[PDB]
Amino acid sequence: TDIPWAEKRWTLFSTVWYLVQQLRFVGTPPALRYVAFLGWRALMFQVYAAHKALVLWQCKLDAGLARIGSGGATATFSKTMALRRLHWRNSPLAEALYALNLYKTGRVHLLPPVAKPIPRPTFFWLF
Amino acid sequence: GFLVEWSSDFITIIPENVDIYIWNVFSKIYRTIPLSFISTTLG
């Protein structure tokens, strides 16, 4: 009941994606799809574990960088930024500008605004 | 006997059950053609 009229555009890209999807849904038996589903789940769990490790590492790294920045005492980090990194709410430019702000003025609590969601790209009858 | 069949229409004598059975068997036989074709022609 709530589909945005932009997911219902008929374009030349979508009449081929239709064939890809119709293969996956009607031309493949549900048992092989189930096996692939299990495998993909296991893979995603491994990837999430890796990403969490990396996020904690980033927290130490920036807590260390704020020390150079302030030159003196500051050693903490921002938990807000850790949680925002875990949920993919930063653009790469925001990360770079935060790193620079840390390196130059400490100021661990000044955070870039937030990333906005990407809109669906459309060209014409083409895609 | 044989004349009531030989002298009437044939789609009204035959039930729909047999048409559904034939269609089901045919459908089940030829339903793996897209995946087979795709996997053949792609090396």
A9: helix, strand or coil: coil
Nearest Cα residue in chain B from A28: B35
Does residue A27 belong to the interface with chain B, where contact is any CB pair within 8 Å? yes
Does residue A80 belong to the interface with chain B, where contact is any CB pair within 8 Å? no
Does residue B11 belong to the interface with chain A, where contact is any CB pair within 8 Å? no
Residue A74 has phi, psi (to 5 degrees) of: -45, 125
- Residues with Cβ within 8 Å of A126's Cβ and at least 6 positions away in sequence, in order, are A11, A12, A13
Does residue A23 belong to the interface with chain B, where contact is any CB pair within 8 Å? yes
Long-range contacts of A96-103 (CB under 8 A, 24+ apart): A98/A62, A99/A62, A99/A65, A102/A62, A102/A65, A102/A66, A102/A69, A103/A65, A103/A68, A103/A69
C-alpha distance across the termini of chain B, in Å: 60
How close A56 comes to chain B (CA, Å)?
Answer: 44
Q: What is the rounded distance in angstroms from the CA atom of residue A108 to the CA atom of residue A101?
A: 8
Contact assessment for residue A38 and residue A27, using Cβ atoms and an 8 Å cutoff? no
* Chain A contact set for B34 (CB, 8 A): 23, 27
Tokens, residue A105: 């003025």
